[PDB]
Structure formats: structure tokens, C-alpha cells
Amino acid sequence: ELVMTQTPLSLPVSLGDQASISCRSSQSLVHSYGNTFLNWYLQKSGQSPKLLIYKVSNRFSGVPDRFSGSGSGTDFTLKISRVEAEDLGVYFCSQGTHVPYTFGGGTKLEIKRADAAPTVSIFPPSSEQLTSGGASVVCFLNNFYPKDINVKWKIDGSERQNGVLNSWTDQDSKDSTYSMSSTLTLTKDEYERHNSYTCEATHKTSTSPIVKSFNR
Amino acid sequence: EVKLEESGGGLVQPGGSMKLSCVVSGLTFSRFWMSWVRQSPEKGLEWVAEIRLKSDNYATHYAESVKGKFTISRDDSKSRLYLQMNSLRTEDTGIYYCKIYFYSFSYWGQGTLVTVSAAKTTAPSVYPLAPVCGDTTGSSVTLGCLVKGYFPEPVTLTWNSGSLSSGVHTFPAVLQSDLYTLSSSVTVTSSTWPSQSITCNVAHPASSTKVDKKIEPR
């Protein structure tokens, strides 16, 4: 098993800056003279991997000169100059020299940008749901940076999280933010048992939490 | 212009079989070696099988983890790659890509979802998320859609039939207890809604569910 180790796992860089990405192998990948089969792919969110670099340093179709690959022996590097907008995604190396073929664990490129408070929206259970005997409360926390956020649910002031489902987005390609959804799912009878529903967000942009709420 | 296209994924129970197809165009298929690679959020990219050329007597190689359970084959005449999977286990769950390569190139298909699970196909419930105080009081307001309790994975969600593209955030589904939950938000101008209709278009092909949920104010 050829081991392909990449670093870093995550690489935040600012626009116009240089990104350097490392892939190391547990052994020589030289297939023949002139032929070292190490590839670099870019996989963008919800997309297929796309070849950027082949045979260590050769640029594939449409691939800008901003991208350069290098290395030998067991150390390989991907460097991209003047990092652009659409450069976001996961970068993977792969070896085609020894069967079984193997890949690095990937490196995610993150575009740095100014800090951004989440835009918080809270929603009550719908009548359709309540009629089925259910009550989900939802809170969106959208277009924030950086990605690290924490979310608490408080019912009638008391903290309370049980039946909570959280999901978040990948970095936005146009504005470089992150968004998050949090769903608190109660039975109608329990939902009915209380009045004030609050979604509470802790993000670096604020010293206090940022909260939205309603009372049924 | 090379195009690779995987087909035949879907939901299958443990111990089951399933055959993937991969149609390629844009080059001379018979000239190149091909492989199947799968991806999971938990394990990343894993090669499972390769097939070479006629001149090679169609030699094949497999990852030890699928040896004797997977068979890769190709039909040079139809430019199609196949993967016969039997004895499927839940850990075989993933997106399966076919790819074609050579000294100077590599191409992957768009990938096809393979879900190996004992869980039953289930139609989602679609619920509209309207605000209370309403955002239409600050210039912009955010609406939502909650698609709850479906299986397996793929649903499609659009707003106003895809006409609202910008200002939309569709969150990745999350699985719990063999049922998925997904959600999505739309942010529009306050002068827009509720005066003009905004509708969540949700489809769950596996159950042939199609729902057009109008988000009404209040």
C-alpha cells in the first residue's frame, strides 16, 4: 500500500497570496525515466475531481501558469500563485505508479476575508407539521466568517438541546462566507408546553451571543 | 471533448448486487486503461478496480477489500465500462466514479451514488418556513423549506422552479436513524414577498415525490 500523506489539511490564504501544498509518498513513484506518475486534482464542492497537474509538473488543459507542481523522490509540492476566487476546493495528490493506486487525504483551500457576523433567522413550526403532531423550530445563521460557530437553543430561558440537528455549508465561491442551519425538533405537545424559543449564536465577531427569538 | 458518465447507482440492501455502467465519449475508449474509484466523506478516495486492454487480454486488478465480490469489465464496441458488485456491505456505500487515463491525461465521470442499506425507501415531509415578525420590514427577508424524514439521500430543491438561484443556501442532508433531514433558505427583498409568491420545489425521485410548497406569510 503506497501511502500518500498531504499537508496541510486546511490552508487559509488571502487573495493574491501564494499557496503551497505538500504531498509525501512512502516510496519512489518513478515509473520510468521521465515518468513519475504523481497527479494533482482539484475537487470543488459537489463536483468531480479535475486534473490540474500530471507527471509531477505538467499542467493539464486550461490550467493557468499560476499553478506549478514539483518534487521528486518522495516529496512533492503544489504551489499556486496569486490565489484567485474560484481556487477554493479540495486539492488531492495521487500516485499512478504502483497498484493499488492511492490518494492523499486532501487539502482544503480556504479564502481569507474579513470577519462577518451571521445573519440569524428563526422559524416556528408550520401548521402542516403541527397537524401531524410535530414541531420543528429552525434557525439559519448565514453568511458568516470565520467558520467556527456555536449554537444553543433556550426554551423559556432555560438552555435546552435535545432533538437538535445541525448542518453547514462549504465556503461560498462568491463571498467566501459560511452558513449554518440548526433544527430543534419537538413533539407538538412539548412545543405547546412552553412559550419563548431562542436560537443563540456564539461567534468571534461578537463579545455577547447573537440571538433571535419568538414566543408562540 | 472527453465525457465520462456513470449510471445505475441507487439503494441496495446488504448482501445485494448492483451493476454500474460508465459510458465514455470524446476519445478512443479501446486504447486506454480504466478504473473505478469510490469516495466517502468518512474515508475519502479509494481505488477499487482497474481494467487494461484487449492486447493485455483484458487484465484486471482489484483492491483487496473487494476481491472476489467486484468484477470490472469493458465493452470496447460500445465504449462502456462496468462494475458488477455482489455481496454488498454497508461499507461499500459511496459515490462511484469511473475514470480513464494515460501518460498525458486523466478524466473522471460525474460519479454515481451507491447506498447499501437495510433501511426502507421513505418519502419526505415538506414544510414551509415563514418568519413571524417578518423580515419584509428591513428591506430583505429570509424564508425557508424543511424536507424531513426521507430515504435514500438524493432530493432536489429549487426555489420558484430554479428562477431564484442567488441568495439561496441549501444545507447538506443529515442522516439520523435511517432517515434524512435537509433544509434550505432563500433571502429576498422585503418588497418582494409576501406580495409575490415564493415557492419551494422539492423532489424525492426514489419515492417519486414532487412537492410545490408555497411559503405563505404569518
Do A172 and A105 sit in the same domain of this protein?
no
End-to-end CA gap in chain B: 52
Q: Nearest 5 degrees, angle CA A103-CA A109-CA A115?
A: 155
Edge-to-edge order in the sheet of strand A196-202: A158-159, A150-155, A196-202, A210-215
- In angstroms, rounded to a whole number, what is the distance separating the alpha carbons of residues B98 and B83? 9
Do A17 and A107 sit in the same domain of this protein?
yes
Alpha helices in chain A (DSSP H): 127-132, 188-192
Interface test with A, best of B171, B177, B179, B188 (most A CBs within 10 A): B171
- In angstroms, rounded to a whole number, what is the distance separating the alpha carbons of residues A41 and A23? 12
Among residues A93, A113, A133, the one where a domain terminates is: A113
Among residues A113, A144, A163, the one where a domain terminates is: A113
Task: Output the DSSP codes for A99-149.
Answer: SSPEE---EEEEE----B--EEEEEPPPHHHHHHTEEEEEEEEEEEBSS--
Cβ count within 10 A of residue B145: 26
Do B106 and B170 sit in the same domain of this protein?
no
In terms of Cα–Cα distance, which of B108, B106, B23, B37 is closest to B70? B37
Do A137 and A182 sit in the same domain of this protein?
yes
Do A77 and A7 sit in the same domain of this protein?
yes
Collect all residues with Cβ–Cβ distance below 8 Å to B176 and sequence separation of at least 6.
A165
Domain count, chain A: 2
Collect all residues with Cβ–Cβ distance below 8 Å to B180 and sequence separation of at least 6.
B124, B149, B150, B151, B152, B153, B155, B173, B174
CA of residue B67 relative to chain centroid, distance: 26
Do B190 and B113 sit in the same domain of this protein?
no
- In angstroms, rounded to a whole number, what is the distance separating the alpha carbons of residues A158 and A151? 14
Burial (Cβ within 10 Å: 0-12, 13-18, ≥19) of residue A62: exposed
- In angstroms, rounded to a whole number, what is the distance separating the alpha carbons of residues A53 and A65? 11
Beta carbons of B132 and A214 less than 8 Å apart? yes
In terms of Cα–Cα distance, which of B119, B124, B143 is closest to B182? B124
Do A137 and A102 sit in the same domain of this protein?
no
Do B79 and B25 sit in the same domain of this protein?
yes
Residue type (1 letter), A94: S
Would you state the torsion angle of the CA atoms of residues A27, A32, A35, A39, taken in this order, to the nearest 10 degrees? -30
In terms of Cα–Cα distance, which of B147, B188, B183 is closest to B164? B188
Beta carbons of B144 and A138 less than 8 Å apart? yes
Listed resolution, Å? 2.2
Rg, C-alpha atoms of chain B: 22
Q: Is-contact A201 A149, C-beta < 8 A?
A: yes
The boundaries of the domain holding residue B201 are 119-217
Do A38 and A50 sit in the same domain of this protein?
yes
Beta carbons of B97 and A48 less than 8 Å apart? yes
- In angstroms, rounded to a whole number, what is the distance separating the alpha carbons of residues A39 and B33? 16
Residue with cell 509525501: A24
Beta carbons of A96 and B101 less than 8 Å apart? yes
Collect all residues with Cβ–Cβ distance below 8 Å to B105 and sequence separation of at least 6.
A51, A54, A60, B2
Do A104 and A162 sit in the same domain of this protein?
no
Task: Output the DSSP codes for chain B.
Answer: --EEEEE--EEE-TT--EEEEEEEESS-GGGSEEEEEEEETTTEEEEEEEE--GGGTS-EEE-TTTTTTEEEEEETTTTEEEEEE-S--GGG-EEEEEEEEETTEEEE---EEEEE-SPPPBPPEEEEE--SS-STTSSEEEEEEEEEEEBSS--EEEEGGGTB-TTEEEEEEEEETTEEEEEEEEEEETTTTTTS--EEEEEEGGGTEEEEEE----
Beta carbons of A119 and B35 less than 8 Å apart? no
Do A108 and A118 sit in the same domain of this protein?
no
Cβ count within 10 A of residue B152: 27
Say which experimental method was used.
X-ray
Phi-psi region of B95 (alpha: psi -120 to 50; beta: other; left: phi over 0): beta
Edge-to-edge order in the sheet of strand B125-129: B125-129, B140-150, B179-189, B168-176
- Identify the contact set of chain B against chain A, taking CB-CB distances under 8 A: 35, 37, 44-47, 50, 61, 63-64, 97, 101, 103-111, 125, 127-133, 135, 142, 144, 146, 148, 169, 171-174, 176, 181-183, 185, 187
Beta carbons of A142 and B97 less than 8 Å apart? no
- In angstroms, rounded to a whole number, what is the distance separating the alpha carbons of residues A125 and A133? 11
The boundaries of the domain holding residue A179 are 114-216
Among residues B93, B118, B143, the one where a domain terminates is: B118
Q: Is-contact B108 B97, C-beta < 8 A?
A: yes
Size of interface A-B (CB pairs under 8 A): 114
Q: Is-contact B6 B18, C-beta < 8 A?
A: no
Grid coordinates of B100: 480513464
Of B47, B108, B131, the CB nearest to A48: B108
- In angstroms, rounded to a whole number, what is the distance separating the alpha carbons of residues B63 and B36? 10
In terms of Cα–Cα distance, which of B206, B49, B211 is closest to B145? B211
Identify the three-state secondary structure at position A192: helix
